[PDB]
Design a protein around this ligand. Sequence first.
Ligand SMILES: CCCCCCCCCCCCCCCCCCCCCCCCCC(=O)N[C@@H](CO[C@H]1O[C@H](CO)[C@H](O)[C@H](O)[C@H]1O)[C@H](O)[C@H](O)CCCC(=O)NCCCCCCc1ccccc1
Ligand SMILES: *[C@@H]1O[C@H](CO)[C@@H](O[C@@H]2O[C@H](CO)[C@@H](O)[C@H](O)[C@H]2NC(C)=O)[C@H](O)[C@H]1NC(C)=O
Ligand SMILES: *[C@@H]1O[C@H](CO)[C@@H](O)[C@H](O)[C@H]1NC(C)=O
Ligand SMILES: *[C@@H]1O[C@H](CO)[C@@H](O)[C@H](O)[C@H]1NC(C)=O
Ligand code: NA
Ligand code: NA
Lengths: 272, 96
Amino acid sequence: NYTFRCLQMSSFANRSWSRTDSVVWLGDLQTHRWSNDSATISFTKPWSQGKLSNQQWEKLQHMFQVYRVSFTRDIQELVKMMSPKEDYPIEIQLSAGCEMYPGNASESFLHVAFQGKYVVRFWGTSWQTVPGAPSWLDLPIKVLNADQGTSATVQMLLNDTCPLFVRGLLEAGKSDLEKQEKPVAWLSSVPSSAHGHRQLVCHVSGFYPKPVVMWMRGDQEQQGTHRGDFLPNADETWYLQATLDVEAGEEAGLACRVKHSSLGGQDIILYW
Amino acid sequence: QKTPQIQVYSRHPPENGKPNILNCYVTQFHPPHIEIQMLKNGKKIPKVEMSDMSFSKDWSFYILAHTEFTPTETDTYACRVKHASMAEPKTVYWDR
Ligand SMILES: CCCCCCCCCCCCCCCCCCCCCCCCCC(=O)N[C@@H](CO[C@H]1O[C@H](CO)[C@H](O)[C@H](O)[C@H]1O)[C@H](O)[C@H](O)CCCC(=O)NCCCCCCc1ccccc1
Ligand SMILES: *[C@@H]1O[C@H](CO)[C@@H](O[C@@H]2O[C@H](CO)[C@@H](O)[C@H](O)[C@H]2NC(C)=O)[C@H](O)[C@H]1NC(C)=O
Ligand SMILES: *[C@@H]1O[C@H](CO)[C@@H](O)[C@H](O)[C@H]1NC(C)=O
Ligand SMILES: *[C@@H]1O[C@H](CO)[C@@H](O)[C@H](O)[C@H]1NC(C)=O
Ligand code: NA
Ligand code: NA
């Protein structure tokens, strides 16, 4: 049950300066990078071509090469006519891909944002502005919707190519996608923002996959445990910390317990 | 415009005199143009590796910087970020 997403980031600073950079993710592993500076899409995994042949991959890449140039020109052409309604600097983001479900199912998506805000999607057979998008987009979107060759291609990419490609990645990327890396944990403390307190920190690093942490007094979970966000390590593992703000002397008897799929029933328990 | 949030953390449990990796994770910013520096005792660390720029469901950008380091009792580490949302560079110190 994975989300596959191709993310494009385009910056237009003026008439003469633009760049477009992409990254692709299968769940939380990066499979591709496509820099503005590169002609070709780079694999960031051995299995990034999935089960497509070299011919199929070349064709898919060619389509995207044509697209990247056509995209940049269309946007700059649109900035010449719209001036000075909207002008530089302009940021555009696309997020396209599919979500793979229980055995059978799959749903695809293509979303576009302008200046950090969701404004357009592809839906079924056409481009649509979302409710509340700025009305000057209605004409460009009409012009784009008149291009039936683009619409057919995007339909093929979303309905067919996207779920096809991902099935192959899931197979060819099995051992990375199902890898198990063990958390290592440690305890520290830092000054509290509350007087007469210290903040105890349980750090958990190097674990994969993401699901994973509680401060404990014996069997009693400490409901003051404040779990932070999942932070990435550079080696495709995860970091998380859980804090507990404690009165001085109340510190004794506290433990941090960690459960993770990779430890196989055998929790880490550290004592303060 | 969105202001970057900055978090600094080590890969491995710190022990003094043991090689380790220091991470500076920068999130929640817009636009994507940004400058990130990691500092040791107030001075820029020359070789810092940068992940590819990416973005979240909410459209805000994120990027990971990391560098090799070996902590000691007296060395301080930080991550400093320059971005158009903030008049002043934001610095976050690694804890202990
Ligand atoms: C998607 C999942 C794919 C499966 C996964 C595969 C994974 C492989 C690795 C992927 C790495 C990919 C990184 C990229 C990620 C981004 C994916 C986005 C993909 C979506 C774009 C695909 C368009 C292909 C068609 C096309 O090229 N149309 C062109 C060219 O048109 C001519 O040529 C074609 C065929 O050659 C036909 O002959 C046509 O009749 C003919 O006119 C058009 O000029 C079109 O205008 C390009 C631009 C379309 C587009 O963006 N529109 C986005 C919406 C507009 C922006 C909205 C917001 C906005 C902001 C500011 C101002 C205005 C609007
Ligand atoms: C791609 O899939 C979409 C479904 O998401 C198809 O669009 C539907 O087509 C039917 C039957 O032709 C229409 O009556 C529906 O209204 C469309 N659905 C929506 C939500 O708009 C589309 O035809 C498919 N394209 C290809 C080439 O297979
Ligand atoms: C366009 O933008 C780039 C990047 O910000 C800048 O360095 C360049 O001087 C600008 N050029 C013009 C003609 O405005
Ligand atoms: C991005 O790539 C295009 C097309 O190759 C190039 O002409 C452009 O100058 C590049 N932009 C930057 C900022 O390097
Ligand atoms: Na690119
Ligand atoms: Na945007």
